[PDB]
Design a protein around this nucleic acid. Structure first.
Lengths: 122, 109, 48, 48
RNA sequence: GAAAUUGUUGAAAGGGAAGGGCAUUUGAUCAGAC
RNA sequence: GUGAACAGCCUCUAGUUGAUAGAAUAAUGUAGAUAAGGGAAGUCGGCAAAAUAGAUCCGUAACUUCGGGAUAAGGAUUGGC
RNA sequence: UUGGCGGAAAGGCCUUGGGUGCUUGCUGGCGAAUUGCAAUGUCAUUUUGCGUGGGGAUAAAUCAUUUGUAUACGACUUAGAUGUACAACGGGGUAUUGUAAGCAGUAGAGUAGCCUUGUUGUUACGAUCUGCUGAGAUUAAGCCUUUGUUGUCUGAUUUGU
């Protein structure tokens, strides 16, 4: 959501030229980061390996108002509210390894070739 | 911490308000004093005395004096301390003329 | 340096100056030296 | 550095102002000596 | 509790559109039969 | 108060200080302006702008239904003590 | 390992010496099978990663602050860890205007009063005038300079063949 917005030098850090400081959207997010941190600490989580593993925003129902236009017209003046979810997780080590055996099937020609190499060298 | 010092400064507002819109001269002189104190004392927050507000606005919105003599003081913060433990507080100085004076340090008593 | 040789009857002229302006460029300069200004005006109240 | 004014005696035969004063405009370029540090060689190749 | 439309995760492709048809390579997945 | 003036400008009583704000001062705009020399050559066309302008004194043509035209046109003066 | 040559994209070519393996130049001895009648029947080089062991060396950029030789915003150009450093002031220079406030005057068209009865009589008012006074004010905001005063100089993010 960046069309025809201004450019700034503080987008260099992210490889972008269009960046912005959504103070209202920031304060809403860091209020929910505080809530999740309290929820994690109430669960006994360490709070030092916590990271934001999931956060999503989708659209709430619109809020309606009216605009007055020239020559006696009425147009919509609407708010686009948000639902916000986020999850903080403890970071852990590698999940697993040593995958399945993946049994291999050899034809009789391939089996003989293998035995030929074993016979031919130590 | 340390450096609770107070010093006397002369600010050249004539070079700072040069070519500014007339309805903005006194309001912008307010923002210049805050930027001036931040430079010389390093404090993010700067408080202006109401009688210094009078000194700026004495001759209307577009009659700001060319030079003002200021008493800028750094002090400990109190009352539910904000991020800055120190703040700058700025007084006007009652002199006949503000031209020809050098910055001086005021003793603490 | 010039990339070519030009006689041009204008580039071979020997230019010998006669007078260089040293009046102030910060206004309508009136004097060439501080000594010249002191002679024309005389003594001022700044002078002791 | 800037502009300044010069007076010099013009010398060109066939002109109205020959051997007669002309006021002239010049520009002064400030040129201290340059310090030689390094040298580079350029080979001539089919691609420049 | 559908669709248009949207967010997140996953997969893939992208030198001035995209989408489609015949054929096959590659990757993912899968029924039958034994 | 100025002033012929319930003009225009400033002030007293009374009432407001309401119109999203902040930073910079690119182009092009809206509104306000000034320009050497020329002076309508611009343009359908002086459109727009400029010039004149209050008051006192002097002077005032053609024409006319004799009432006007007329503030015609054209000159001078203007403060303070 | 010795010595050269080659810069057009050389990045390869030639050469001296010794060591080592093989040699089908010629004549012998042993082994192969069963992948079953074919199934490419797997022998190449691209890049990357994780390990060892052996050497090699210990930076910057961006944000933020700052300048205006730049500028709509980005971008550009400068400066900043202790110094012919930077900044805020002050001083000087350079410029603009045209002679500041204050005080004094036997200046001043005149008017009015006073008695000590003038003869520069004094006093009160009085646009303006003269002197201190080319004075005073302003002077970088995109002017120049500085043996002066004061202060400042380790915050954030990111980048690896």
């Amino acid at each position: 959501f960046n069309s025809s917005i201004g450019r700034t030098a503080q987008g260099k850090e992210f490889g972008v030229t269009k960046a912005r400081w959504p103070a209202k959207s920031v304060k809403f997010v860091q209020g929910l980061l505080q809530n999740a941190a309290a929820n994690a600490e109430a669960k006994g989580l360490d709070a030092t390996k916590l990271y934001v593993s999931h956060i999503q925003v989708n659209q709430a129902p619109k809020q309606r108002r009216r605009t007055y236009r020239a020559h006696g017209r009425i147009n919509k003046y609407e708010s686009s509210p948000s639902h916000i979810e986020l999850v903080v997780t403890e970071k852990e080590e590698a999940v697993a390894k040593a995958a399945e055996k993946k049994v291999v099937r050899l034809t009789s020609r391939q089996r003989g070739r293998i035995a030929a190499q074993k016979r031919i060298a130590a | 911490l340390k450096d609770v010092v107070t010093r006397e400064y002369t600010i050249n507002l004539h070079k700072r308000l040069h070519g500014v819109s007339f309805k903005k001269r006194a309001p912008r002189a307010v923002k210049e004093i805050k930027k001036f104190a931040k430079l010389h004392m390093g404090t993010d927050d700067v408080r202006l005395a109401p009688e210094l507000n009078q000194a700026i606005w004495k001759r209307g919105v577009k009659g700001v004096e060319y030079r003002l003599r200021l008493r800028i003081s750094r002090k400990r913060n109190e009352e539910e301390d904000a991020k800055n433990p120190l703040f700058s507080y700025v007084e006007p100085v009652l002199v006949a003329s503000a031209k020809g004076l050098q910055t001086v340090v005021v003793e603490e008593d | 340096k010039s990339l070519y040789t030009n006689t041009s009857r204008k580039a071979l002229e020997e230019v010998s100056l006669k007078w260089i302006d040293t009046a102030s460029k910060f206004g309508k300069g009136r004097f060439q030296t501080p000594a010249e200004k002191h002679a024309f005006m005389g003594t001022l109240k700044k002078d002791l | 550095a800037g502009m300044t004014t010069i007076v010099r005696d013009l010398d060109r035969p066939g002109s109205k102002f020959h051997k007669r004063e002309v006021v002239e405009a010049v520009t002064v370029v400030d040129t201290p000596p340059v310090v030689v540090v390094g040298v580079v060689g350029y080979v001539e190749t089919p691609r420049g």
